[PDB]
């Protein structure tokens, strides 16, 4: 069984971050390092001062929560269809058993998805605590001679982008939470 | 039920825009960055004046829009298909009340989509006044000195669509507009 | 109804010109403006003479008047598919009118695909005069000194795409027309 | 009807050149004229240099070729579906005048698609006599200054892919002519 | 037939390895040598340094394990269908014999699986000792003069998506010997 | 028919042959040219020195084996369509003497492919003797000045994929012989 209460929005609101991180990985982001450039002779200083400010990229951080947010219903697909084909073979009590053995399974992934969310976003949070992106970074790492300045790409777009994913994360996580308190509600009015 | 006056329009205009971006993107708007040049020895003024003067490129906000315009039609589609697969388990007076529920809730997804072009129509204007680029812009952000002159890719051909997605975006506005009132009329026309 | 006199030649010479527009765009110009050079020190002088030059590129007017020519296709059989389902609804005199409306709206998209055909071409012959690109171009636009001499990429074949597009376009126009005259025939020979 | 002797090999044949153009397109000629480089340190020598010994690029040549021996194909193809859609009009002695009738068609379509391998043929033969690319030209086109040597790409892949072309397009007119005969020998044999 | 156990979660990391890969080969690897970068005025040194430090792309031995993990599924699933072919063909005790035959070759099917995952485990190992990458490299392959310092693209990103990957092997390898012991102490239960 | 020995096994190797192919082209052979640097300042040795080191690229030596493998397949796939389809108007003794007709085709297809494979790979051998690439080669071809030296650009993963496709052709070449004696073996069985 389907709640429209959660089922439709996330499904909607998952699609709408899918098409977000296609539409900015692939523009927006695509010069990250190519356009990333610092006030400096010394050779090397652009890369180490990329790495050291960008350890991993903003879209590939949502391209990895978006996947990992999706396994749980891979998996719970596939293993309806293992059992529709046990069905299935057991057709060329026990029903109502497999139904139930089905239902904390499928609690169990939306639990499992709202946790992911949120280790992403924590995730996030510890590696860029400001949400908006600065135009000029100050560099010490070594072999940039003392400190250096280098410029970000683009930091408003990719502030805007940002803004937005956190956005529909942050509506993901209330969505989910609501729709575990809702299956919780109808349990209990079943009894 | 669909009405010939405004939903053929606004599904051959949203394919048309669509189209258009589709073509603007890849080529007309692919260098607006590499290509961008300023006149200095500044290192990191190129980068600074790009994001001073473009704080979100064109076709961002036309994909942005047109995503968000598309989402209440997936919000519907989807309820639509979940109200469809629990007649279907009703079948292995509560019809006529789903359909009347059904017909609320597309209203206000019509609305809802022609705020969304408003909203984003008012966000361009905001941006970007003008609705056709300049040749040449004055930058004064730091690190750049004093004022320096920095030079646009192709002005002509992006102030060309972009006119044309204004256009589109307009007429979608009143098409969605004359929409609303005729489906108001032929309400009043029922009882 | 149909008819093999207008309706064949017409889609099959308008996907031989998607065809020749997919192998055109990607490789001929492709490198348009990144190739386009001036022989000059000043700076902004290559993009400010390549937009002056080249409002906007052969390619993408070709696809704007490929796209909408193609508009009154989509919106002629979306109206059809329309009517079919109010058809399906009404099986779940007034026949022999649809009908008559649908040809008038198939005339009218006739009419409507050749005046477009011809308004692209007279634009064509506004923005680039000679069908054929030159090797050399002189270039007096601010900040370019006095006048310097810019190259363009691939003249030849670019030259040899537009008469192909140019010729077909031509084509397309005289069958609209030879169409229209037969549409006409045969409404008269029906009376 | 259908000859197994012209139409089976003239398809894969066909298909074959289709594989050998898109391998070597992609890879072969991508870098043409970004890899052209002239001795000289005249501005624009390059492009103009280029333009003079490659007007069209081989493999815009055989995509034309394709598209223009596949549309004789496509124009029977749509118009025996017109024929057919007729037919099933009629369903809800003039068959074998429309037989007749088609049968024509389809032997014209073979002139016609062996006329244009010809052409392409003899206009390849044209523009680059020499079956074999070589390493170095010699260029005197304005404003290269007397004589410069050019290097092209990848002369010996080129070569190879040419040679491999030009045996498919004559081994392609080769049985398009005997397809030919043996439709009149068979024409004959019905009498 | 199949097993819950082994099955479903197989697959289901195997997809979520493909989907891993797609999104790190595509941008994260893809300036591996590009960006590679040494302090150095000698020509070649990067080139021989890259080949020295990176025998062989991550995203390549990655893509060589997926493919090798993935053949005898191909195979089994290719041998079943010819003797679901064999099978239609007597249609138009040794059934049970067939059954038994593809029972050892899928076991054996899963054996080459977990033997590749773990030699390509150890090829990594042996290639790449350590698990994360380092910022710089020291080379002192010919022609560079001494020892030069060489600057790595993106080393805490590739070193995060390197985790994932041997993570996701090493889960990959305990399910497959979990699956061949389940398979086991079926086979005895069924004794 | 169809013999599980030799079909499926070739099936799947080839299949594998695609994939490997298809992961090497991209991402190892990409840059084969264009980080291709020698050691001096004469202009156009480079391309020079790359076209006599590399005549014809790996990948593209790979593809059109491929390709030439695949045509007989093709060739008998739409042969044997043709036959069903005059079954299929014979049908709105002869049939026994049409799968003789098929069963030799089908052998002079396998010895085909088997032929080219062989030619394929002696071709292979001709052109680059040592399997393993070189660091550093040896320039002396004009314009060069005397001998330079210049640097492949990914020596090490080059010849760790040749090898791959080395020894998949060797063992597709092994299992054709096979297929072939086992052929011959059954229709002596037969008789």
Redesign the interface.
């Given at each position: 069984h389907?709640t429209?209460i959660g089922?439709?929005?996330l499904?909607?609101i998952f699609?709408?971050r899918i098409?977000?991180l296609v539409?900015?990985?692939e523009?927006?982001?695509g010069?990250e390092?190519?356009?990333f450039?610092?006030?400096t002779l010394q050779?090397?200083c652009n890369?180490?001062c990329?790495?050291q400010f960008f350890?991993?990229?903003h879209?590939?951080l949502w391209?990895?929560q978006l996947?990992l947010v999706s396994?749980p219903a891979?998996?719970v697909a596939?293993?309806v269809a293992?059992?529709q084909?046990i069905e299935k073979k057991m057709l060329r009590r026990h029903k109502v058993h497999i139904s139930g053995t089905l239902w904390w399974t499928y609690v169990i992934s939306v639990v499992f998805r709202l946790l992911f969310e949120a280790v992403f976003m924590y995730v996030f949070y510890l590696l860029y605590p400001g949400y908006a992106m600065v135009?000029?970074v100050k560099c010490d790492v070594?072999?940039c001679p003392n400190t250096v300045?280098?410029?970000?790409?683009?930091?408003?777009?990719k502030t805007?982008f940002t803004v937005?994913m956190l956005a529909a994360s942050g509506i993901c996580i209330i969505l989910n939470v609501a729709e575990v308190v809702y299956l919780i509600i109808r349990a209990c009015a079943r009894r």
């Open positions: 389907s429209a089922g439709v929005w499904s909607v699609i709408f098409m977000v539409v900015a990985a523009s927006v982001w010069d390092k190519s356009s450039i610092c006030n050779p090397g890369s180490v990329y790495d350890p991993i990229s879209v590939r391209s990895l996947i396994t891979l998996l596939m293993h293992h059992q084909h135009r000029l070594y072999p300045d280098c410029f970000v790409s683009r930091p408003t777009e805007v937005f």
